[PDB]
Every structure is written in C-alpha cells, then in structure tokens.
Amino acid sequence: MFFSVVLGLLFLVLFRSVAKKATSGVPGKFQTAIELVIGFVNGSVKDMYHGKSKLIAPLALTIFVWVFLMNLMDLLPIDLLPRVVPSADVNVTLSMALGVFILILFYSIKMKGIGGFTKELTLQPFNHWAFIPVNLILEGVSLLSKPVSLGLRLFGNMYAGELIFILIAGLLPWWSQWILNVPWAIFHILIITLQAFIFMVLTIVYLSMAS
Template identity: 35%
Template sequence: MTTMVSAAEEFVPPSAPDFWQPLVGTGAFAVTRSMIVMLLVTLVLAVVMVAATRRLSVVPGRGQYYLEGVYGLVRNSIGRDIIGSAHFRPYVPLLFTLFTLILLNNLMGIVPPVQFPTMSRIGFPLALALGVYVVYLVAGVRRRGLGGFLRNLVPSGLPFWVVPVVFLLELVTFLITRPVTLTLRLFGNMFAGHILLLLFALGGEYLLLHGEGLLKLVSLPAFLMFFLFTAFEILIAFLQAYVFILLASVYIAEVYADDH
C-alpha cells in the first residue's frame, strides 16, 4: 500500500506489540492499559449490581428488569439446561460473574474513549479459564474422590493394554487441551477483531491524509468497513461471553453426567 501513496509518511499497520501499552513502569511489573480497563469494568459492574438490586421489588424497575433478564439467561438457558436442575445452583454466581465480566470487557473494545478489549491480552482469558478448571476439578474430586475422578477418565470395557494410553490422552485433554482452547477461543476472537478495527481506521485515516489524488477516495470504503466491523464486534462480544460460559457449563456438567 505504501508504494501507492505519498512517501511523506510510511503507513505502519497495527501489530501485537500495540496491545501492550504500558502506562506506568516497564517490564513484567508495568501497569498497562488493559489492567486499567479491567479495574474500570470491575468498578462499573459493582456499581451497577448494587444500584440495580438495592431496592428489589415484585414489579421491577428498569435496572432490575434488565439485570434479571441477563441473570435469567445465564441461570436458565445455560446453568439449568446444561448442568442440570439438580446441581446447577452453586455454579450460577460463577457463570453470571464470568458472563457479565467478559461481555463488558469485550464491549470496551468499541466504547470511546477506552476502545480496548481487555480479553485481547491473553493473560486475562487464561486466568478466567484456569478459574473454571479449578472449580471443575474440585467439583469432580469432591463428588467421586480423587481415585474415582481419575478412573472416570477412562471408559470401561477397554483392553488393559489400551488403558494407559487412553488415560494419558484424556488427562492431557482435561488438564491442558481444554483450558488452552477455552483461553485461545476468547483471546483469538477479540485480538483479531480489534486488529481489523485498527487496520480499517488507521488505513482509512492514512489514505485520507496522505493519499494522492483519487486514492483519497479509497478511504471512504475503509471507514465504512470500520463502522460495519464495529457493529459486528458488538455481536462477537456477546457471542464470545456466551460461548465461554456455555463451554464452562458443559465441562462442569460432565461431573454430574451419571445423574442425567
């Protein structure tokens, strides 16, 4: 692209280092923009939850109505339907917290002046995925005992010489593959989406300011794609939060699979 535009300033496309953005300090102990966004989201959620539930009533106000709608989606469509009506209640607070936290953090990618999706930094979805797996493993061990939990990894009826191989594969799947894929699914979608938004916005700006002649007109479709992808990111933000708790519920439901 740079060969087709004025050489006054070279266009630098967005890349992974642009997501680091340290605000205070350097290295591993730097306070980054993503940390500030996560803190802001946590404070906003706390204020909204307290304000919406401070005066609960049989006929809900607007805030209580919307909050109950989100809670009902998580409780009934995810928790009860997937984990099962006999066991889902202890996990509803976890699922509701994960859903609202992930959703609002995702939406921060398109909310001015923040415009930074926290989950595009892999450490945040990794921490959430590990939290889910701690809950899953503790629930499994408490229900079946450590020996029963490990035995349940291998289907019954297999030839004895196959059991060690299947056990190792299942152990890797449960302890490594699942948390990694749960992390990468959320991280990858939010990272890629924000890269596209930056590319269209910065590319359109560069063509408008530094393009020559009719090339400036190419900035118009670039800006149009930016607005279209912004609207699309709203859908992605919701879907990724929904899919995360959906998969978390599926994994937890396996602990109680013998009751269904």
C-alpha cells in the same frame, strides 16, 4: 509497566465494576424494565441450570452471570469510538483469569464431587477397557489440557478479535469501511460473550455429567 501494569489495572477495574454494580443495582431498583430483564438472566439461567442444575447452581449461577457482566468489558473497548495499553494485557489478563480459573475448575469439581476423589481412579477398568494405558492417559491429559486449551483458546480468540477489528478500523483514513466492519464485528462480539457463558455452561454440564 504502563503497557503491562496499566493493563492489569484496566481489567481489574472492569471486574470491580462488575462486583459493585451487582449488589448496588440489585438492592435497587430494578425496577420493572430492569426487573424483567433480571428475569431473563436469572430464569433463562435456571433453564440453563437444569442440565447441570443443582451442583454449582449458586456457585456456577452467580459465576456465569458475573461472566456476562465482566465479559461486556471488551464490548466497552469496542464501544469506545463506536489507545490501548489497558486492554491488550487486560485482555491477556482476562484470558488468564478465565482460562486459569478453568484449569482450576477441573479441580474444583474434582474435590467438590468425585469426580476428583474418583478422578484419581479415572484410569480404572477404563484404562483396562480399552486395556492400553496410552489411550486412557493420552485421553485424560488431553482432557485436562484440552479444557484449558478450549477455554483459553476462546478467550484469546476473543481478545485477538478485538485487537484486529480495532486495527482495521483505526489505520484506515476512510471511515465507512471501519464502520461496517465494526458494526458486524460488534454483533460478532455480543454473540461471542453469550457464547462464553454458554461455554461455561458447557464445561459445567460436563462437570455434572463428566465421569
């Protein structure tokens, strides 16, 4: 399944690269040019923590950092020239790990805190408040689906964006247009990844505050 299996292979490779690069450069050096940046990441990540802060701080902190790292993999395909069947269903694959992991995440806070021991009680006087079950139920379902809908929607929006900018650039015989698009699209991409970490933080600060 080249156009398929080759794709999952690709995204898997990126994720591994994240894993090893972590401990490897982390034992060293960083050093200082490197150290200071690591400070931006970790410390800005701490300011971000406050807000959700303590609950997932190891769990979510490690995660979001890994999310920037793994998220850069798409920038790599954009960075390539700056032909597929890695990155199409490797991008679908990332949308699946991320969005699937998000549906998983609602549960992970659910059991991790109540939250979910209390989430079964979500109906509550809230379904009585608001006395109709249609309101509370449509709301909660729209929430669980909506978390997946939002996160997956962002993921696929990103992957698709990659595919499209790629198309515009590659088909055209004239290079200049492809360049301007690709540069603008590149700023776009970086913004998108940071926006992703922010989105994880948004779902998470949700979780701390959510119910």
